Amino acid sequence: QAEWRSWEVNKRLEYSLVKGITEFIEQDTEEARQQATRPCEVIEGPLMDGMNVVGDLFGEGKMFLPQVVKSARVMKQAVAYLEPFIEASKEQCKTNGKMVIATVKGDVHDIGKNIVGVVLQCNNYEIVDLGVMVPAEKILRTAKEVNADLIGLSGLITPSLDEMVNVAKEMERQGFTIPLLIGGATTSKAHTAVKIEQNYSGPTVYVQNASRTVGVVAALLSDTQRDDFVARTRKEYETVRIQHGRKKPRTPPVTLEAARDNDFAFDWQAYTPPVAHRLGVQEVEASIETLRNYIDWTPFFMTWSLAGKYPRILEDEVVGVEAQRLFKDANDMLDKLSAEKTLNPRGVVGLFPANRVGDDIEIYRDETRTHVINVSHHLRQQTEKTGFANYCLADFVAPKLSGKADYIGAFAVTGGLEEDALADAFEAQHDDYNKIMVKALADRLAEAFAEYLHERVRKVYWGYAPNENLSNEELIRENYQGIRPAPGYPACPEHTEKATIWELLEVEKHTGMKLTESFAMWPGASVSGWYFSHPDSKYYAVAQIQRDQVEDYARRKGMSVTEVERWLAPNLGYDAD
Numbered sequence: 001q002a003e004w005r006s007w008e009v010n011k012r013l014e015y016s017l018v019k020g021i022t023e024f025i026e027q028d029t030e031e032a033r034q035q036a037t038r039p040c041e042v043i044e045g046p047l048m049d050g051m052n053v054v055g056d057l058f059g060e061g062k063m064f065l066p067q068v069v070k071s072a073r074v075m076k077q078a079v080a081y082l083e084p085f086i087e088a089s090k091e092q093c094k095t096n097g098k099m100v101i102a103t104v105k106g107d108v109h110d111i112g113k114n115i116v117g118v119v120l121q122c123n124n125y126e127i128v129d130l131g132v133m134v135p136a137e138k139i140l141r142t143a144k145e146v147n148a149d150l151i152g153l154s155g156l157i158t159p160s161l162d163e164m165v166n167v168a169k170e171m172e173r174q175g176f177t178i179p180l181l182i183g184g185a186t187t188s189k190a191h192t193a194v195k196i197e198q199n200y201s202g203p204t205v206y207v208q209n210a211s212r213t214v215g216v217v218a219a220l221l222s223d224t225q226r227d228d229f230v231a232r233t234r235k236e237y238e239t240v241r242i243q244h245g246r247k248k249p250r251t252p253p254v255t256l257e258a259a260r261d262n263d264f265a266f267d268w269q270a271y272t273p274p275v276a277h278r279l280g281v282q283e284v285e286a287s288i289e290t291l292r293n294y295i296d297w298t299p300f301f302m303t304w305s306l307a308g309k310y311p312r313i314l315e316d317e318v319v320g321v322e323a324q325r326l327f328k329d330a331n332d333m334l335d336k337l338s339a340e341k342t343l344n345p346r347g348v349v350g351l352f353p354a355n356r357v358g359d360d361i362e363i364y365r366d367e368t369r370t371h372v373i374n375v376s377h378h379l380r381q382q383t384e385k386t387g388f389a390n391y392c393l394a395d396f397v398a399p400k401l402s403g404k405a406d407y408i409g410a411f412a413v414t415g416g417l418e419e420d421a422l423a424d425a426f427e428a429q430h431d432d433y434n435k436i437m438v439k440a441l442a443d444r445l446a447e448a449f450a451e452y453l454h455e456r457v458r459k460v461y462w463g464y465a466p467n468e469n470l471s472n473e474e475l476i477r478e479n480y481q482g483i484r485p486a487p488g489y490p491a492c493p494e495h496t497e498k499a500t501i502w503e504l505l506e507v508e509k510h511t512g513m514k515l516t517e518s519f520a521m522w523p524g525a526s527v528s529g530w531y532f533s534h535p536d537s538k539y540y541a542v543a544q545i546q547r548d549q550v551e552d553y554a555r556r557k558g559m560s561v562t563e564v565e566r567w568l569a570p571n572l573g574y575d576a577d
């Protein structure tokens with residue numbers, strides 16, 4: 001009765017792998033397994049005779065990642081069935097190469113890595129994933145214990161770039177020869193070509209996306225290009241170095257002295273800082289239903305590699321259809337989670353009295369302005385300014401020497417602690433779709449809580465806009481007074497400051513969230529930052545900070561001048577080691 005259920009199980013298998021169907025997969029995988037001598041011919045047969053189809057159609061714009069992930073599911077549920085008949089009839093069976101991929105020790109961003117991960121499992125490459133915040137040691141060990149042909153690391157935070165150079169050294173100090181691919185959006189063909197490739201006498205290549213990966217990995221293993229490639233790359237990474245070496249610099253830096261003097265000019269005498277309708281640290285929660293109306297689906301589609309800016313992306317004559325069903329499944333999931341409460345976004349907010357002092361934000365235990373409960377430290381742009389001031393988030397706060405009782409706030413929210421468990425849940429049932437789906441949503445609900453919270457802060461809590469009324473649109477455009485910078489962003493690059501935010505809020509004590517070693521957060525889908533009210537506070541980039549400030553900062557933090565140089569490596573205005 002089903003026109004497609006009337007074909008050879010080897011052509012319906014290609015169908016199941018294309019139209020993503022696991023309903024008749026176990027039979028369409030067993031039938032071809034019985035019509036097969038040694039159990040693995042199906043693996044290298046109709047499975048790949050279909051994956052190569054999934055790929056070819058993928059590259060012709062006749063498929064998209066969202067679908068390829070549903071295809072990879074059938075391919076894994078098909079292999080999750082032929083695992084036994086190959087455990088008792090071990091034959092290994094050929095692939096296109098094995099590779100150990102993992103998220104640089106300390107970092108949490110993994111989806112971008114899990115995408116490139118399957119994109120290769122669609123080219124018959126075996127990908128022994130390791131996860132996030134994985135120690136460079138475990139990574140190399142795996143490379144050996146599994147005799148991998150390559151190693152791909154992924155990191156999007158600042159500490160990453162440093163923990164990556166570590167692996168390059170270890171591979172070079174332990175005799176490795178397999179290539180070393182650096183991954184991440186933040187990681188550039190520059191940092192890789194200047195601060196990493198030179199620490200490993202082996203192939204160290206960078207890739208922009210999960211699309212280029214397939215191309216690179218290929219000509220990196222091919223016995224007819226592997227040489228033309230490597231040489232071509234090394235000669236290129238040579239250009240980058242000398243290129244940025246010449247542009248080093250174009251805009252001369254400045255002294256922390258002349259910098260602080262040329263600070264955000266503003267007459268605090270005329271102005272009068274808006275008092276906080278409230279003060280203290282209050283735990284806060286919000287149903288998924290409440291947050292759903294704050295979600296920014298733009299990045300959501302942007303994750304599944306779908307060019308578009310919601311909602312117009314739902315129309316787009318290209319992926320409009322896919323963007324829809326994806327958006328459908330997304331919501332359909334949020335529905336079950338919101339009803340079953342199987343996921344509950346949690347968070348905490350706080351408001352304290354504070355004042356600026358040089359480049360720091362003194363935080364008092366109460367209006368008395370006597371005893372300090374902590375001090376938020378902030379850097380200051382250190383390049384030559386023309387017409388503008390070397391901005392520092394400290395400026396936007398009333399200088400202690402003005403009496404103007406100013407205030408500052410902080411927060412830390414998560415799309416729920418159940419992220420991990422849920423992810424592993426689908427992980428077991430071999431379903432990368434919902435696994436990456438829930439992770440993506442957790443991120444959404446997470447950032448959604450950040451807006452929803454900040455709103456109630458601008459309106460109620462802080463109270464400098466109680467009658468403020470905006471639609472999700474205006475919010476994304478940031479149609480409001482004040483900014484909510486967070487540790488890591490160009491405004492406040494120093495990551496260890498997350499410490500302060502976790503201190504002042506007793507976050508783990510009110511939310512459960514935790515800070516690892518590289519000052520990463522938990523669960524993965526979690527955000528935390530500050531709150532500033534001053535109607536002129538804007539997001540800028542600290543840029544390049546010179547020595548004199550690294551020291552002075554290491555002095556205010558009590559951190560070893562060197563250790564500091566590490567956390568702000570990408571921001572250092574010189575070439576330290």
Ligand code: B12
Nearest residue numbers: 112152154158183184185207210488489521525526527528
């Ligand atoms: C979603 C997201 C998050 C999630 C993370 C969960 C997850 N699994 O991804 C959430 C909302 C929780 C978050 C929080 C934070 N984030 Co964030 N986040 C993003 C965002 C919007 C997109 C990145 C993303 O996932 N993209 C989609 C994927 C598919 O793309 P991709 O990672 O770039 O991958 C492509 C390639 O680069 C490549 N690639 C990647 N992996 C690999 C591996 C190999 C082997 C190879 C060869 C290539 C390769 O393949 C991909 C194509 O598919 C960005 C903005 C941006 N500019 O990218 C910031 C960004 C990464 N975040 C940033 C920061 C500041 C933070 C926080 C510290 C903020 C805070 N709360 O205080 C925290 C991290 C701590 C924590 N534990 O939560 C910065 C980093 C800057 C810095 N100096 O540190 C960014 C760049 C923003 C900015 N412009 O400043 N984040």
